[PDB]
Paper text:
Laccases are members of a large family of multicopper oxidases that catalyze the oxidation of a wide range of organic and inorganic substrates accompanied by the reduction of dioxygen to water. The substrate oxidation takes place at the T1 site and molecular oxygen is reduced to water at the T2/T3 site.
In the present study, we prepared the L499M mutant of the laccase from B. aclada, in which the nonconserved leucine residue in the axial position of the T1 site was replaced by a methionine. In the T1 site of L499M BaL, Cu1 is displaced from this plane towards the Sδ atom of Met499 by 0.17 Å. Hence, the 140 mV decrease in the redox potential of L499M BaL can be attributed exclusively to the mutation. The specific activity of L499M BaL towards ABTS was lower than that of BaL over the whole pH range and was lower for 2,6-DMP at pH < 5, which is consistent with the lower potential of the T1 site of L499M BaL. However, in the pH range 5–7 L499M BaL showed a higher activity than BaL.
Author numbering: 1 to 404, 409 to 543
The structure:
Amino acid sequence: SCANSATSRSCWGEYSIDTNWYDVTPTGVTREYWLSVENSTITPDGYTRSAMTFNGTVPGPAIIADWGDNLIIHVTNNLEHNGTSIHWHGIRQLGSLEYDGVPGVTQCPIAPGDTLTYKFQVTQYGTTWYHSHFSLQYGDGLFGPLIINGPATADYDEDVGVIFLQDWAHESVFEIWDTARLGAPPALENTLMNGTNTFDCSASTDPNCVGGGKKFELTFVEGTKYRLRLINVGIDSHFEFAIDNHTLTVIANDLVPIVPYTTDTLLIGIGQRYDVIVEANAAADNYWIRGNWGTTCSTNNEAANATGILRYDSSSIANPTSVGTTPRGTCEDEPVASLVPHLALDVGGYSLVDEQVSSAFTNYFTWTINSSSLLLDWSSPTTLKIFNNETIFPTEYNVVALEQEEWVVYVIEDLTGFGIWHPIHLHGHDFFIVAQETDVFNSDESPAKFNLVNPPRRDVAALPGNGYLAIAFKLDNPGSWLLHCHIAWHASEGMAMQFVESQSSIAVKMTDTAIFEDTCANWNAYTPTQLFAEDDSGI
Ligand SMILES: *[C@@H]1O[C@H](CO)[C@@H](O[C@@H]2O[C@H](CO)[C@@H](O[C@@H]3O[C@H](CO)[C@@H](O)[C@H](O)[C@@H]3O)[C@H](O)[C@H]2NC(C)=O)[C@H](O)[C@H]1NC(C)=O
Ligand SMILES: *[C@@H]1O[C@H](CO)[C@@H](O[C@@H]2O[C@H](CO)[C@@H](O[C@@H]3O[C@H](CO)[C@@H](O)[C@H](O)[C@@H]3O)[C@H](O)[C@H]2NC(C)=O)[C@H](O)[C@H]1NC(C)=O
Ligand SMILES: *[C@@H]1O[C@H](CO)[C@@H](O)[C@H](O)[C@H]1NC(C)=O
Ligand SMILES: *[C@@H]1O[C@H](CO)[C@@H](O)[C@H](O)[C@H]1NC(C)=O
Ligand SMILES: *[C@@H]1O[C@H](CO)[C@@H](O)[C@H](O)[C@H]1NC(C)=O
Ligand SMILES: *[C@@H]1O[C@H](CO)[C@@H](O)[C@H](O)[C@H]1NC(C)=O
Ligand SMILES: *[C@H]1O[C@H](CO)[C@@H](O)[C@H](O)[C@@H]1O
Ligand SMILES: [Cu+2]
Ligand SMILES: [Cu+2]
Ligand SMILES: [Cu+2]
């Protein structure tokens, strides 16, 4: 039993970095939050535009808690013309399926003017984020940081918090969706680093291009070790984060602490999080912070300006003249060999489920999973079906039923030919990356090459373009769990499926059943006169 501190980050009282947090949870306290989903106007980069925000800021307010705390988060939808539904990214929701926030799966949408109070315990610690999982809303700024304090696998003095990395349009994503769904995502007008960037409005005739955008700035005190919590939250952005003339000691991936490793740059797919410790041991100077936008992965109009500024002297106003490390320049994830959980777990005996991604064109460009593109009915979410004792779901719900062989290995194959590295997010579980391969899956040979012995473990991992991703998870969380590409266009285009896991073992408190019913009653009251119908997959 030791206290967490700058020289004992492994400690968490009677618990520690060695505690199995899948099986053991500290007692904490209840923390209550009130969030308002708003229709806003912001100027993050000297361009004024609309946004959909929590509480009028991009990013939204920080939700900060300790490992074990119970969170009560009242979410009121103050948009006029969209439902909304908020997901707590990577959060296991063991026994709280109905608060996972996936509209069409775990809830009906929150109708305009309605409130839904999300309740869940945090049985994980580290860096994550919360965001709307209702259509493309997070692309208009509807996300915020969710930081759960706990132990760490390397010592550090100061936690600077999250640095968000994203693309950023100069108009609502909902304005460009009709063009994007023809099949080619647009190059967006800029990027943001923790909510800010420069933009040259000097030659603009657009009255909204008011200028004054500023670089993200981070100040170091020489000798201090800083925890930076990196999240890629773009619509369709890949990053390779780096700080010139500094080394990153990587200590967590998503919500899983790893054996520290050092790296000059850090590949980060959408929805992925890393925790790094940077020691401020360079010559004191201004250094460029590089997002290293992956131009081979997706387009942006201003890729080279996905940068911020590290200062050792905060009174300096000069731009860095530092020289960047040459990026690997791929759309890959960090190498599997680098991502070794500190808490070592092995994958047990399993049953294999194989699915294949392709594309089709119906009304617009769609992605298919075993020939079916996800299309959900917001007024009949999977959980509603489950509470009605339905076990056969619509084809377009892309349900795979799991029932106990205590483990599943889920192989998803890219048969599209496109060579996109798709960030695949699984809800309700950390998975084990048993293979992440650039090659064709062979059901007779590939399983023999799976790594079942402490493989990487996280909640978002790349399906390699033209390859396969084999992820294992244990049947330990009855529910209906969405799995999808986190490239927002692709999710909206149906690149998703869901696991209905141990359906008959789902338990929901009567109070939460009543709440769920109320949410859907209110949604159903809104839809007859909504201005805008569902026009994508729902998620
Ligand atoms: C959620 O609310 C947003 C409003 O904030 C809705 O966005 C609207 O979406 C419609 C349908 O896609 C857009 O119409 C299209 O606009 C483009 C661009 O001018 C045009 O080329 C198309 O032919 C079509 O008219 C509309 O622009 C857009 N409105 C705004 C202000 O962005 C969205 O549909 C809502 N979704 C739900 C599910 O309630
Ligand atoms: C990126 O932008 C956000 C601001 O949009 C910064 O978020 C800030 O993060 C820090 C550290 O995690 C938060 O500090 C904590 O505040 C709470 C509540 O009062 C307190 O309990 C803790 O002791 C700690 O001071 C801070 O709340 C938060 N600010 C906002 C507005 O949410 C973040 O720091 C930026 N990243 C960098 C590297 O600058
Ligand atoms: C968010 O905004 C709403 C509406 O004004 C308010 O009730 C709530 O307290 C605010 N929450 C935070 C965290 O500021
Ligand atoms: C947000 O406000 C804008 C400007 O009034 C409006 O055009 C748009 O429909 C609103 N969006 C939603 C989702 O309510
Ligand atoms: C998806 O299709 C492939 C190829 O036909 C088949 O091998 C696999 O079992 C299918 N998966 C499921 C879950 O239906
Ligand atoms: C679902 O099954 C349970 C268990 O038998 C039963 O109590 C409940 O009423 C059922 N509900 C419906 C709507 O079929
Ligand atoms: C993470 O660790 C692996 C194995 O040592 C390296 O191959 C990689 O480049 C990174 O350091
Ligand atoms: Cu997410
Ligand atoms: Cu994708
Ligand atoms: Cu998701």
